[PDB]
């Protein structure tokens, strides 16, 4: 094909004008196009271009054709785009100062680019009609919503629940949950993939910043611990680029924020493995029940509760790393510090919105003490650091407090799809064989395929394992009958494609950057690199963890560990 774009000739592909332009350093804007789909109904038309002889077309869904002459920047094109943006301003409370997307908003960028102006500024006097903060995990601010459909499409594609809907409310279109219910009261997973898809501040996480501020100000001993994924991602929000390991800077920043103890959820990950690998070995000895499923992803737990309740008894009884850590923080940690358990306030930093729901489940407490008092997302921590004027990108490295802060390489990889599986197999196989095996890499469970399997030899018998990478793939695995091609023994499920590194609490990424950078792979690489360089690569070799079990919990899977570190869903 010979195509002319802005008077420059190209000889080439069967692709859209937008993709060809993005591949050839030609500027075309876009808004509603994401995840390979636009808002098929009510298209934004921000990607308008002129095709000579045809007229104005949407570049995001128009294929190039031999002989095409395209102009991306004529007066007629720019006036059309400007008009569409102006119409969006008419429904948009354009008040960026206090907005939680001020630094990385796709809409502000477009307003500036086209010098767009509302025909009538939208100045709602009462936000309460527009705001839904009922959920434990998600919030909606419809004063910001462009009705671009990105969230609806992302929910459908990533989860297949269609829990995010277009709704007709009083003759007007909104997005929201089924019947405009609180999300939590629907089949929604609370995974936040809708948030990640949103170009503006319309969808957000339910804030826990109040909880944290108040605890830090209460003369309370405030512990903080971050998830695996945070250290592979938060630097994105400090202009550091992608794939940067910022672990040591985070520890320094958390001390500067005034936390009293700097621990790490990866220590909790090693605890989960102690319990869960022990359980797997028991199920092997007992001839089942099989399969055992992981229980550490709250989004998956809700998927099982909402769609597959017959599987709940097959979930591992080990608490998630977050909850198992929290339980220990109110029991073990007082025993080594002298703190009154009631005065410990435990904060986690997570790449996840569904972790807020998990932490707030009524039974996730003992003796009146919550396992976890507050959960802030990666985004919330970045805001806290910025509000404190901490110069994150140039901080010196520090280390965690060791007693609940050391982690093995097995715990380090939890945030990638297949990480829990690999970590668990490293311990299970030693436990079942009563041996110290040098070969610990399970590359067959790694990477971005939607469903992954492997056959593993454990103590001279073959077992089948599966890794389900994303909620939509759980539905595929079940509905297709794949779960029945063989007897599966152990199955990891993550709700977010890529695992937690791509969770709903993570930094937003510009659609153009997503096309240039494989965010799932690049964030995960930080974690696998840590494992490669850690002196301990098995959870049961974490020295601080060994001390905690030796001194306090006893043997995994029994005694005090069974009594308090487990949770079953009825």
Residue 385, helix vs strand vs coil: helix
The answer to the question of residue 414 lying near ligand 402 (CB under 6 A) is yes
Residues numbered 67 to 106 that lie near ligand 402 (CB under 6 A) are none
Closest CA relative to residue 274, chosen from 55, 495, 553: 553
Closest CA relative to residue 190, chosen from 444, 529, 504, 470: 504
Contact mark string toward ligand SF4, 316..355, x via CB under 6 A:
-----------------------------------xx-xx
The answer to the question of residue 43 lying near ligand FES (CB under 6 A) is yes
Instruction: Give the sign of the dihedral formed by CA 380, CA 383, CA 385, CA 388.
Output: negative
Quote the CA–CA distance of 21 and 74 in Å, as a whole number. Answer: 16
The answer to the question of residue 344 lying near ligand FES (CB under 6 A) is no
Quote the CA–CA distance of 429 and 507 in Å, as a whole number. Answer: 36
Residue 37 is assigned to a ligand binding site = no
Instruction: Decide: 280 and 257 in contact? Cβ < 8 Å.
Output: no
Contact mark string toward ligand SF4, 445..484, x via CB under 6 A:
----------------------------------------
Residue 296 is assigned to a ligand binding site = no
Whole-number Cα distances in Å, 569 to 106, 299, 306, 319? 41, 14, 12, 11
Quote the CA–CA distance of 545 and 399 in Å, as a whole number. Answer: 17
The answer to the question of residue 228 lying near ligand 402 (CB under 6 A) is yes
Total residues interacting with ligand 402, rule: CB under 6 A: 21
Tokens linked to 56: 């104005």
CB of residue 234 to ligand 402, shortest distance in Å: 12
458: which residues sit within 8 A by CB, 6+ positions away? 284, 428, 429, 432, 433
Closest CA relative to residue 537, chosen from 374, 345, 406, 380: 406
Quote the CA–CA distance of 405 and 266 in Å, as a whole number. Answer: 7
Q: Length of the chain in residues, anyone?
A: 570
CB of residue 193 to ligand 402, shortest distance in Å: 13
Binding partner of 265, given ligand FES, ligand 402, ligand SF4, none, CB within 5-8 angstroms per partner class = ligand 402
Backbone angles phi, psi at 50, to 5 degrees: -105, 130
Residue 182 is assigned to a ligand binding site = no
Beta bridge partners of 346: 223
CB of residue 32 to ligand FES, shortest distance in Å: 3
Binding partner of 45, given ligand 402, ligand SF4, ligand FES, none, CB within 5-8 angstroms per partner class = ligand FES
The answer to the question of residue 404 lying near ligand 402 (CB under 6 A) is no
Give, rounded to a whole angstrom, the gap between the first and last alpha carbons of the chain. Answer: 61
Instruction: Decide: 365 and 373 in contact? Cβ < 8 Å.
Output: no
Residues binding ligand 402 (CB under 6 A): 227-229, 265-266, 268-269, 296-297, 320-322, 350-352, 355, 414-415, 420, 500, 503
Residues binding ligand FES (CB under 6 A): 30-33, 38, 43-47, 58, 60
Residues binding ligand SF4 (CB under 6 A): 92, 94-96, 99, 101-102, 105, 107-108, 138, 144-151, 154-155, 158-159, 161, 163-164, 175, 183, 188-194, 197-203, 297-299, 351-352, 354-355, 494-496, 499-500, 503
For the annotated binding site for [2Fe-2S] cluster, the residues are 32, 44, 47, 60
For the annotated binding site, the residues are 32, 44, 47, 60, 92, 96, 99, 105, 145, 148, 151, 155, 188, 191, 194, 198, 297, 352, 496, 500
């Amino acid at each position: 094909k010979t195509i002319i774009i802005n008077g420059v000739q190209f000889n080439t592909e069967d692709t859209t004008i937008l993709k060809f332009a993005r591949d050839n350093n030609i500027d075309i804007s876009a808004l509603c196009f994401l995840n390979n789909c636009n808002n098929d109904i009510n298209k934004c038309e921000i990607c308008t271009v002129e095709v000579e002889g045809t007229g104005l077309v949407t570049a995001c869904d128009t294929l190039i054709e031999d002989g095409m002459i395209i102009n991306t920047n004529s007066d007629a094109v720019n006036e059309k785009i400007k008009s569409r943006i102006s119409q969006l301003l008419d429904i948009h409370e354009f008040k960026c100062g206090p907005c939680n997307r001020r630094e990385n908003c796709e809409f502000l960028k477009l307003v500036i680019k086209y010098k767009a102006r509302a025909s009538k500024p939208f100045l709602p006097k009462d936000k309460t009609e527009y705001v839904d903060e009922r959920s434990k995990s998600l919030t909606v601010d419809r004063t910001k919503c462009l009705l671009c459909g990105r969230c609806v499409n992302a929910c459908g594609k990533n989860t297949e629940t269609y829990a995010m809907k277009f709704l007709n409310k009083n003759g007007k279109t909104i997005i929201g949950a089924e019947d405009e219910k609180c999300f939590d009261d629907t089949n929604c997973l609370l995974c936040g993939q809708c948030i990640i898809a949103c170009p503006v501040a319309a969808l957000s996480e339910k804030s826990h910043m109040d909880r944290v501020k108040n605890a830090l100000n209460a003369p309370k001993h405030v512990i903080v611990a971050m998830a695996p994924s945070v250290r592979a991602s938060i630097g994105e929000l400090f202009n550091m680029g992608f794939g940067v390991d910022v672990t040591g800077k985070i520890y320094t920043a958390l001390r500067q924020l005034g936390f009293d103890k700097i621990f790490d959820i990866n220590f909790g990950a090693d605890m989960t493995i102690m319990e869960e690998a022990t359980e797997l070995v028991q199920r092997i000895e007992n001839n089942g029940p099989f399969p055992m499923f992981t229980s550490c992803c709250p989004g998956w737990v809700r998927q099982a509760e909402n769609y597959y309740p017959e599987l709940l008894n097959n979930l591992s009884s080990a608490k998630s790393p977050q909850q198992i850590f929290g339980t220990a923080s109110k029991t073990y940690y007082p025993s080594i510090s002298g703190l009154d358990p009631k005065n410990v306030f435990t904060v986690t930093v997570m790449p996840c919105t569904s972790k807020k729901f998990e932490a707030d489940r009524p039974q996730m407490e003992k003796d009146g003490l919550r396992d976890i008092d507050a959960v802030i997302t990666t985004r919330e921590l970045a805001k806290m650091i910025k509000d404190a004027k901490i110069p994150f990108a140039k901080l010196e490295d520090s280390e965690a407090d060791p007693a609940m802060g050391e982690y093995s390489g097995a715990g380090a990889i939890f945030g990638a799809t297949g990480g829990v599986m690999e970590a668990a197999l490293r311990s299970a196989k030693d436990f079942a064989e009563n041996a110290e095996l040098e070969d610990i890499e399970y590359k067959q469970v790694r990477g971005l395929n939607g469903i992954k399997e492997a056959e593993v030899e454990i103590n001279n018998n073959k077992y089948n394992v599966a890794v389900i990478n994303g909620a939509s793939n759980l539905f595929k695995f079940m509905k297709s009958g794949m779960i029945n091609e063989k007897q599966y023994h152990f199955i990891e499920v993550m709700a977010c494609h890529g695992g937690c590194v791509n969770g709903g609490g993570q930094p937003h990424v510009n659609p153009k950057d997503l096309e240039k950078v494989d965010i799932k792979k690049v964030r995960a690489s930080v974690l696998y690199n840590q494992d490669e360089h850690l002196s301990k690569r098995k959870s049961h070799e974490n020295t601080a963890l060994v001390k905690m079990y030796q001194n306090y919990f006893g043997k995994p899977g029994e005694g005090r560990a069974h009594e308090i570190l487990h949770f079953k869903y009825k």
